[model samples]
Target: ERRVRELTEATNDILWEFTADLSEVLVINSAYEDIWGRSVAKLRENPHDFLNGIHPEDRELMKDTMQSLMDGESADVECRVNATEEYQRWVWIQGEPITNDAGETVRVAGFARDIT
Candidate 1:
C-alpha cells in the first residue's frame, strides 16, 4: 500500500477521478492546483470549478469532449487553462468512461497533462 501510494503521487499528470453522477471527486492530484493556479479546496467545493481556469476559446471544444466521455465514449482534447500571470497554459486531456458489469456507465476517470 505504501509503495502504491508513493508511485501514484510520483506522476506529473493531473488526475481527475470522479463518480459518474459527479457527486464527489474521488481523487485529484496537487499537480492540478500547481499548474492551474487554483486551489484543490476550491475544486473540491465545486468540481466544475475546474472549468473556471479553462480558456474561453477552448471551452466549447472541451465541453464536447467531456460530453463524449459522459456518453460512454473516450475522447482526447488539447486545450488551454488559465495559469500564473494570466497566461494561457496548454494541456492535453483524455477521458474514458468506466462501466459496470451491466455495461452501464458508473464512473469517469481521466488525466490531464501540462504540455506547455
Candidate 2:
C-alpha cells in the first residue's frame, strides 16, 4: 500500500477515483499537467476533456470501453495523446475497478506511462 501511493505520486500519471455513480471525480493525483499538458481544472470542468483530445478515430471505442470499466465491467485500453511535432508520444493506460471490503467498487486506479 505504501509502495502504491508512492509510485502513484512519483510518476506522470493520474490516480483517479470516481464516485460509484461515476458523476464526480473524487480524487485526482497531480500528474495531469505534466503528462497530458492539461490541468486538473480542465478535467474537472469536463471529465471527457482528455478523451476529447485523443486522436479522433480512437475516441468512441475508448470511451465505450472506459464506460464499461466504470460500470463494473472490465477494460484495459491503450491510446495516444497528440503532442507537439518534436515530442510526439503515446501513453498506455492500464486500469480497473478496485472494490471495497463489501464488494463495492471504491476506486478506479490506473497508471499512465510515456511511450516514446
For model 2, how does the per-residue alpha-carbon lDDT over 1-116 read when each residue is reduced to its tens digit? 96996787664566666555556676677765666666778777766666655666667777676677767776667666744332355777776777778766666766767654
Worst 10 residues of 2 by lDDT: 80-89
TM-score (C-alpha) between model 2 and the true structure: 0.64
Top model number, lDDT: 1
lDDT of 1 by residue, 1-116 (tens): 96896686664899897777677787899998878889989888887777778877787997687678777899899988874536568889888888899877778888998877
lDDT of 1: 0.81
Model 2: runs farther than 4 Å from truth?
Answer: 1-11, 20-22, 83-87, 98-107
Global Cα RMSD, each model: 5.4, 5.4
What C-alpha lDDT do the candidate models reach, one value each?
0.81, 0.66
Candidate 1: residue 94 lDDT (0-100): 86
> Model 1, residue 51: what's the lDDT?
75
